[PDB]
Amino acid sequence: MIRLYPEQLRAQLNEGLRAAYLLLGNDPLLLQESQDAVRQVAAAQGFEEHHTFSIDPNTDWNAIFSLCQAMSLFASRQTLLLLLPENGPNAAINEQLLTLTGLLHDDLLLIVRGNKLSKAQENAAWFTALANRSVQVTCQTPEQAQLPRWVAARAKQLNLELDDAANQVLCYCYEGNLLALAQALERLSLLWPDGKLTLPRVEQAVNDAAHFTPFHWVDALLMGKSKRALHILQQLRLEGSEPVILLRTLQRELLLLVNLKRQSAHTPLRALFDKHRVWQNRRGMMGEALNRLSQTQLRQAVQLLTRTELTLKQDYGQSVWAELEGLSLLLCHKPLADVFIDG
Amino acid sequence: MKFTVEREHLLKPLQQVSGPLGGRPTLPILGNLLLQVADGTLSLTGTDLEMEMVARVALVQPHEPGATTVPARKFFDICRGLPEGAEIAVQLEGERMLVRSGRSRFSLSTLPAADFPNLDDWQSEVEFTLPQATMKRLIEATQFSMAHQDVRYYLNGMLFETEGEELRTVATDGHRLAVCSMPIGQSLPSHSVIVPRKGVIELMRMLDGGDNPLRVQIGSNNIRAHVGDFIFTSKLVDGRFPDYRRVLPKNPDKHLEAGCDLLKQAFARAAILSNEKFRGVRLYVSENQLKITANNPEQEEAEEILDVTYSGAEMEIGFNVSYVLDVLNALKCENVRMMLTDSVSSVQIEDAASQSAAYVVMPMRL
Amino acid sequence: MKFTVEREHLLKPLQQVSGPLGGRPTLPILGNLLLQVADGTLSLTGTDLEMEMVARVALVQPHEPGATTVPARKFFDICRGLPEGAEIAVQLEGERMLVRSGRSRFSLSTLPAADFPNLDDWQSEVEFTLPQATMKRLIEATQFSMAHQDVRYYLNGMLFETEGEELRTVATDGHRLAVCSMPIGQSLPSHSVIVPRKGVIELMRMLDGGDNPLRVQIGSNNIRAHVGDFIFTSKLVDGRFPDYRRVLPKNPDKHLEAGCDLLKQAFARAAILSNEKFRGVRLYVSENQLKITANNPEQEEAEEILDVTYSGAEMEIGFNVSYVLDVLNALKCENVRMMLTDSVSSVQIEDAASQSAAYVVMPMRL
Amino acid sequence: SYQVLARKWRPQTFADVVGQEHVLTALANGLSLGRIHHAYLFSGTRGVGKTSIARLLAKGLNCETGITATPCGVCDNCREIEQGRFVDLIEIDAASRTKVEDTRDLLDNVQYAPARGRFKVYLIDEVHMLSRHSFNALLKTLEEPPEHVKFLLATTDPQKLPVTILSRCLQFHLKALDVEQIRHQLEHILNEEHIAHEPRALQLLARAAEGSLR
Amino acid sequence: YQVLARKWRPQTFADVVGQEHVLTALANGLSLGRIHHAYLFSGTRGVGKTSIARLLAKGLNCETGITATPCGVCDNCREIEQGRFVDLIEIDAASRTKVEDTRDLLDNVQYAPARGRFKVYLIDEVHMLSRHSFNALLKTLEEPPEHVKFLLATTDPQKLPVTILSRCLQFHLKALDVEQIRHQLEHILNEEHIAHEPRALQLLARAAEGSLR
Amino acid sequence: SYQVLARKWRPQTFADVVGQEHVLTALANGLSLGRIHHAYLFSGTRGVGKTSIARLLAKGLNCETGITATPCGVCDNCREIEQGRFVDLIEIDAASRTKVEDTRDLLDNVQYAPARGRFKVYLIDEVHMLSRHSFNALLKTLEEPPEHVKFLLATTDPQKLPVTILSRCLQFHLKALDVEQIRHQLEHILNEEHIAHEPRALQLLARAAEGSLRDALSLTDQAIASGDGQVSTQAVSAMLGTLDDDQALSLVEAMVEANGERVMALINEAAARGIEWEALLVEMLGLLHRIAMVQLSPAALGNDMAAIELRMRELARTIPPTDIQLYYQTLLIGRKELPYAPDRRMGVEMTLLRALAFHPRMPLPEP
DNA sequence: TTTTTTCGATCGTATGTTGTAACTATCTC
DNA sequence: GAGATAGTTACAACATACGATCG
């Protein structure tokens, strides 16, 4: 299994094709670009048909097998594309894929698109069989740290002069949405033939389309950025996520912080992290939080979290978002009147 | 508007024009027939922006010129429900149309006729006349080979070609090809067009087995057919139909003369043995002998041995049961001829006597 | 225990037994069916705690007496899968049952027979026999008026009344009533019972017009029907039924005699423009004159004029066309007699030839 | 067969109902004056006789003699209603028929004339258990139904009903029975049933009843 | 005995208690000829939404013409009063809320009115319509045929999508005052020849909140 | 007569549409340079010009003169498209027809060449209501579109569409029209219609529009109806007061400044319009909580509450936090004790009085 | 090297599968 | 040339999957 990234796939395609291609990831833009590049190279090499299928319980595997076995009159070397479900293949789908790869032919070129497989899903007979003669491209959305580099590279590839302020604005507005950012770059290039982009020019034609996850909100709270946490919370509320997921995601981290603070009186932080198997990349951040919050805090937060949970799950109230915003401000170093805690 | 006709005369044209109309139309007016009385004749028009059917009926009673639209299903039901021999008198007043028959009276809503869409006039290029039997044979010979549903638009339709004094119909779906040709009797310029599936179905229903010749006109992007008092107009799907001659085998070195009935029985037995989907049936042909084995996944195989007239070297190849069965059924003769080159190559099938109809099947990899 | 039988005889009784059984058994015992080999016959019984279906097949080949249970779905699949003419042998080996289905041996689980909830002792309150034609006629003429789903659970069935020497069937749903009666030539005590709609449908499907008579027994809480070698047992609603006599109008004076075919055609023609949701029509009755009017939400009107034999005063009455059409279809007579009193009272319908069956329709007040 | 005292002693006439004097007087006056409404809603605590009052009113409306405040109790209609098999009296257990489909089916049968009675009575028990869509569907017909249909509603939680329904109904509030009335009814029932009793036991039972006769 | 509510439904703009602003706006619109094609009415229960809607529909289709003071005697007015006019399509959205019903309704809106100059659709309990039903009406509300008018009545306008609210003119009815209710009750009782006392009328008006029904 | 003010003044040229400069400039440059994408998707709020811009693009994409950003408006194609009866322009209301069969037929119709136009444009409106199978069919048709077929999509909830369909089309998002542009457009329309008006009335109408030109035109028409053929400050103010439904913020503002008569007037006005008292109380609680959080951090107030941003920000700036906390506590107590009050209105009035001119005595831990 | 949800009851839309009845076509009297 | 039987198509009923609202 040759593992690669979207930024280096072209050379491999220039080197030569293979029996099958795996496009696993989360970002849609990178997956679509890789699929288009692979299809273009295959068409240039002499591939004509472009059969596509979406994996579903109603899908008929007999037709796929017949296509893989039958031969066309005035065409050869057909290509097959599969769209896996978001959850991933199950045991029945695993057996179907095993049969399909058993019927795999050299002329047939197989492409699979979908989310990355978990530890259990990735370990399968069909996956192991394909690994011998497969190339997998990992398409993971870049994080906030790496986004400016990607934006600068894309702008340079398009022959555009992008300022630092413009790059920062584009990163802030379209964080987590590469497709929207690419379309915005295309629109900006179309608007200005000269290709010189300044801060006012980009500002006049940019909106908010950022996409976040609860983990980003929890990390923002831990670091202590009030504005970022509030923006993430507003974006998540507008998206329409379930508050219970946010509460459960925050509960584990809050309980871990409380336990460490209680046990940090007479124990080094490294020993506690090793005991709790805290991930290395987070360790420092965690420590920072453990230093910023006093012991009186992390008890009011727990009380407010419990009150919000009871309000949501008993009274079916609609004021959960306001309480979440209050708790977010509380986690950051702010006074808080303590009337809203209702302690 | 005002006219009066008989039930029997008006019963069949309504059924003919009500065919394409159905379901929920994109616009409400598309769901209504258009009736025009003029020049001592009544014209009924029904269209759906892709096909148009026009019927004409002669009037032998006093009337008045006019034009208006009326719902299709309700009018057809009213006409059908009335007793045999009843005389239908139709008139228009205000925004309503009154239909009277004996002591029965009905009022139906209508819409202005100025808003009814009509296909733009066009100049024909190739005009000719054919017997109904010729077109029936051509369509029936090369209809089942059309693609039921494919992204490639050209595969959905059928290729009608005029060359010299020959009319040819070609139908393919990427795995089968069917070509038929018949002599019209007059010379026409070379010209090929593609007709959609709906047009083919409409043409098939248009023929009634009578002796009336049908007149066909073909233009830049439209095809029109006159059959007695029925006029059918359709649009042509644009594209580039793949050439049929080149995909034919260049020089099959192996020939096989077989009995059509025996092959049909053997393939039926194999299908009963091979009802399980996936894979097909493997045939091994040797000198004056043939063996058939059902290679469905792991079901019991009962080999069928038959005697044929084969002179080439022995060879085995797999094929799809449905494709060969349909090809054999299309050729309704007693004996057939098959031409092939090797295991991996398209095989041609035709009748022992008539070479007008030919079929090409690509073997499935075993 | 051990028995061998041809597939042809075994097939069809098994289908009938598996009929009542559904996909979801909800209990291990109810999923299976009870097979009992006794004397020189085999009885297969299947129940779902509501209705029981038992079939008996005489066996001539050597067999071992016994009684056990077998899964219904597995046995049905085994009997269906085998080719034509196959002979099926079954033998109970200890806890398991071995079936020699052709050349393939299958194993099925066996459960104790004592746990099968099937009736053993039967007491009949009344019992008789009659040809299948009478039962089929009564059920066909009375079922269409039976209710489907309503709050009044006692109206969701059919009322059978043995009165004197005759049998009567009554059905209603609060909007129309159907009553039929027929003699049987046997003296019976006055006894009324209610049969649920599902049991009525199953009994109706059971009949096939065979010359063999049908035996009917009615107990305290159950009804049993024996036809040929099949027995079907069902339970009763037990909710009391209103007497039909009060429903019928008292002293009807206005009488209309008309032709059944003419009325059917007029109603069918008028129903075209009738409101789809309600299907309401208006009848104006005058001296030898019946005017039928239908309207539509979009002001589409239909009118019909009929000549009948009427001598009463002028009347105007609304109706639901569907019920009238159903009554006319079920009547199957040349002449139709309608009895009415006023414009807000129920209307009775029958055939002038005979008064064996009657129907009542409640007018739609607007 | 044997039946408990609760169901066997259900009142069958306006003279067998204890208390609720204002409601009975209003019903009698309305029936006598001919001012008949098409929406009655009986509200109050439990075990006070809302269903019994509704059944008595329905029996009075559909009596053979005529619209009277004192049903005969002997004609065919009265005994048929008592047995519960009367065709034109539709008793709907709203606690088990909350779905909109049932209500829509019910409202599509309101345009048909009554089978044998002069009115088609719909007696909805525990109407507070219906869904919002059921209430909204009812609203239109309940506002102005045909002239041959009457609606009777019985509930113990009038707060659940939306204000829209309450605005188009005649509301009758049933008071809780006093201790003296309950004791009198209990002693009368026991004397009729030939059961020995003592005053103190009846007083204790009446006090413990908490204003509910059931 | 027909109940008082049904008997005393207003039949003219002079018989409506209160609601001066909406009546004035409708009268001015009808007099000047600036007639919209989508009206929405909001307010608490029993304040005269359906009543004024029916009065407006009668005013539009009156034989004498389009006037703010309908005659009330011509055939159209009489039929609308009796609730059987053919051009006044009254729909109970609470009873028919499925999308297919809306599709069927919209499939036959192009046809001209049978007898009246306008074909008025009056939908009641709009908030009960499904989301798909709401979406299906957007194009028709925006650009209906010249001979079609939509009248909508609801109790909680906040349940409707903002898109629909932007397509129709909104009128909000206010709860009636105690004095107005007392005066209306006094007038009705005087017309009915029923003995009454001021204290009873005061108590009834107090206990009626703001809904005259 | 007079048609409808909104329906009559639909823009028919790129110079008439007001605002949305970026979208118009991008489309004009793309048409001029020949860079035309295979699918466009217009998004934004209601009544901003999505359908108008789509129709203008369709008109300019099939003009007889040629592909241009300034269509003549006089040739046959332009006139027919204006009349909405052009042969090639196949406009489909996706909301009315969402089942798979209708979309299947429409997409199968693409196989035919255009009749009398260089392009056959499909204008699908309200695309978010299509079925899943309809989306699958549209994606299958749109993966490899013909050269003579273009797709225009208008939607208000783009998030409903699948990612696959989004990736295949260029998305243009429209912004709010702002107060000044709406006011100028209303001034121009009224000047063209020869109707008297006053600047303050137009300013109030623009403010009430809330970034929706269609709403502004509807309110202008209603005011003209109420004003007897003219727009006046008093008539518009009365109309807005009748339509005003923000009594919670007004009550909070009146209470915070220690005013009694104003609170009574606001309570009476709220009682005039059918309103649930508990809903009003919880709304006031939410407003106070938002003000407190804004005081804690200026970024608390999001973009959702843009209409009342200024007043809430001013209240947060001026009111000390302790007063906000006390008002929140007393209103919470009032909400708690509301159900046992003699009447909902009386309970709300009592709680307002307590928050206005009273101060509870805290338990103050004595031991 | 990842991690991640309350439950019951009710309403609405779209697609797929199975069974029964009615209409049309073909064969034999 | 007409009537009866069998096969094909259309309509109604039932089951499964997905999305949304209120307590």
Ligand SMILES: Nc1ncnc2c1ncn2[C@@H]1O[C@H](COP(=O)(O)OP(=O)(O)O)[C@@H](O)[C@H]1O
């Ligand atoms: N006013 C009353 N007089 C006599 N018995 C009553 C009275 N109210 C209730 N009961 C008794 O209570 C039993 C049930 O009453 P029920 O109809 O359930 O009233 P509710 O509907 O208010 O619960 C009846 O069997 C009856 O004997």
Ligand SMILES: Nc1ncnc2c1ncn2[C@@H]1O[C@H](COP(=O)(O)OP(=O)(O)O)[C@@H](O)[C@H]1O
């Ligand atoms: N403005 C009014 N003038 C006179 N009567 C009114 C008024 N508003 C309501 N009513 C009375 O209320 C009753 C019901 O009104 P209704 O049409 O149901 O209004 P809504 O549709 O708002 O519920 C009628 O019987 C009517 O007399």
Ligand SMILES: Nc1ncnc2c1ncn2[C@@H]1O[C@H](COP(=O)(O)OP(=O)(O)O)[C@@H](O)[C@H]1O
């Ligand atoms: N930019 C604009 N300039 C002028 N009028 C506009 C503008 N945007 C919207 N309108 C008005 O809105 C109406 C068209 O609505 P539209 O915005 O196309 O609907 P949507 O954008 O919700 O699809 C027209 O009557 C038009 O006058």
Ligand code: ALF
């Ligand atoms: F039947 Al009750 F309260 F118990 F009405």
Ligand code: ALF
């Ligand atoms: F009919 Al209403 F509020 F009850 F309009």
Ligand code: ALF
């Ligand atoms: F016209 Al819109 F959303 F109101 F597209």
Ligand SMILES: [Mg+2]
């Ligand atoms: Mg009760």
Ligand SMILES: [Mg+2]
């Ligand atoms: Mg109303």
Ligand SMILES: [Mg+2]
């Ligand atoms: Mg629009």
Ligand SMILES: [Zn+2]
């Ligand atoms: Zn009586």
Ligand SMILES: [Zn+2]
């Ligand atoms: Zn008039």
Ligand SMILES: [Zn+2]
């Ligand atoms: Zn032009």
